[PDB]
Ligand binder design. Structure first.
Ligand SMILES: COc1ccccc1C1=C(Nc2ccc(C(=O)c3ccccc3)cc2)C(=O)NC1=O
Length: 291
């Protein structure tokens, strides 16, 4: 429905830079030759219809999300042997890249805005039973106006319509909920969506401390560490308000049944009074000043 095979995107889009590479193909920065609008271009070269299903589901996810805090689908093409997914480009970049550029973590007011907007985005997704499943600071993008966009629904799309949990990941899963580490069949429970709430909590600590919990270990031990350890905490509690520590205490619940939902966490005093993104605009403006 959203994929066009008649037109070649190379006549429509000019590749103007490379945003990331991996086994998944590449992500490009692209400028449309007519408008000049920018886009992230996820290009995957594959001819098998099984593999193409996974990526068309990602297009389907983006197409149904009209919420502003999710990256927008700008268009989609398949010809030659490559599928092009054109996605909203966020000039602010990812939060993890911003912390590296500034050589510091976010302030608590900045984390509160990110937390609040992430919670509204998750409440919107979960109401459609879309579970992101791969939250981390690298998948929280920023606009220059100081709002987030959740990105990279690749893991979400490969798990959306199938009943067999894809027990398969790349890299080190610092953000994985303990029931997912233990490979529990969460789809036969009410609590599959709770994995995102745990990942959100880890992402907050990552933004507080620049690196996620257990980043200092040999990466081979992280899964075991997540399964066996008490929930992570802010290691310098005097730096942070009791509301932040309390929010983390309830979100980083190892039991997915009692872990709160995104809607419940929107009632928490850490975010219940956050109405302005000003603190994130300042952060983006300060990051733009460094480069
Ligand atoms: C996290 O964002 C995406 C993630 C995946 C696909 C697209 C995006 C994305 C944007 N920015 C990017 C793209 C890539 C990167 C990377 O460093 C990277 C490196 C290796 C593997 C994956 C990512 C950072 C920001 C953007 O502006 N709109 C989008 O949808």
């Amino acid at each position: 429905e959203h994929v066009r095979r008649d037109l070649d995107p190379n006549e429509v889009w000019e590749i103007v830079g490379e945003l990331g590479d991996g086994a998944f193909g590449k992500v490009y920065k692209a400028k449309n030759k007519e408008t000049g609008a920018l886009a992230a271009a996820k290009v995957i070269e594959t001819k098998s219809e099984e593999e193409l299903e996974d990526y068309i589901v990602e297009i389907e996810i983006l197409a149904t999300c009209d919420h502003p805090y999710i990256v927008k689908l700008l268009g989609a093409y398949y010809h030659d042997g490559k599928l092009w997914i054109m996605i909203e480009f966020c000039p602010g970049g990812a939060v993890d890249a911003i912390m590296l550029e500034l050589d510091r973590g976010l302030t608590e007011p900045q984390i509160q805005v990110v937390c609040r907007q992430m919670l509204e985005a998750l409440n919107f997704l979960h109401s459609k039973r879309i579970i992101h499943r791969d939250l981390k600071a690298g998948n929280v993008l920023m606009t220059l106006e100081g709002d987030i966009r959740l990105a990279d629904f690749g893991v979400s799309a490969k798990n959306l319509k199938t009943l067999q949990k894809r027990d398969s990941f790349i890299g080190t899963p610092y953000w994985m909920a303990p029931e997912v580490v233990m490979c529990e069949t969460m789809k036969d429970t009410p609590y599959d969506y709770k994995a995102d709430i745990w990942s959100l909590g880890i992402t907050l600590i990552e933004m507080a401390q620049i690196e996620p919990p257990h980043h200092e270990l040999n990466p081979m031990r992280v899964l075991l560490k997540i399964a066996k350890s008490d929930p992570p905490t802010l290691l310098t509690p005097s730096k942070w308000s009791v509301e932040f520590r309390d929010f983390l205490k309830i979100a980083l619940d190892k039991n997915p049944e009692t872990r709160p939902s995104a809607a419940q966490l929107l009632e928490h005093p850490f975010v219940s009074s956050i109405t302005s993104n000003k603190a994130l605009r300042e952060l983006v403006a300060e990051a733009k000043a460094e480069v």
